[PDB]
């Protein structure tokens with residue numbers, strides 16, 4: 789087709805949810821919320837990445853939401869625009 793996910797293996801929400809097995813205990817956003825916004829854990833710090841656009845998000849701050857940070861930084865993501 790005309791679009792293509794950066795990371796096809798993380799197409800699935802369940803696969804993204806599994807990536808957070810070792811999400812650090814200081815990272816306040818839940819794997820549920822992050823996976824639901826297309827994000828999976830890169831294994832490094834609190835850095836997640838979008839399966840669709842490939843955008844990365846890290847150094848999360850209080851009051852950050854997954855979807856709002858995803859949209860803010862990566863507004864042309866097909867996942868963000870398809871939601």
Ligand SMILES: CN[C@@H](C)C(=O)N[C@@H]1C(=O)N(Cc2c(OC)ccc3cc(C(=O)O)ccc23)c2ccccc2OC12CCOCC2
Nearest residue numbers: 835843844845846847848849850852853857858860861862
């Ligand atoms: C406050 N909410 C958090 C999620 C946030 O916005 N984090 C940014 C954040 O996640 N981004 C997104 C982002 C980008 O947004 C367009 C672009 C490239 C990025 C590259 C890396 C990386 O090499 O690891 C990480 C993030 C990138 C960001 C955007 C613009 C300037 C700096 C950015 O980096 C930080 C802010 C400083 O520490 C590194 C992460």
Ligand SMILES: [Zn+2]
Nearest residue numbers: 838840841865
């Ligand atoms: Zn995205």
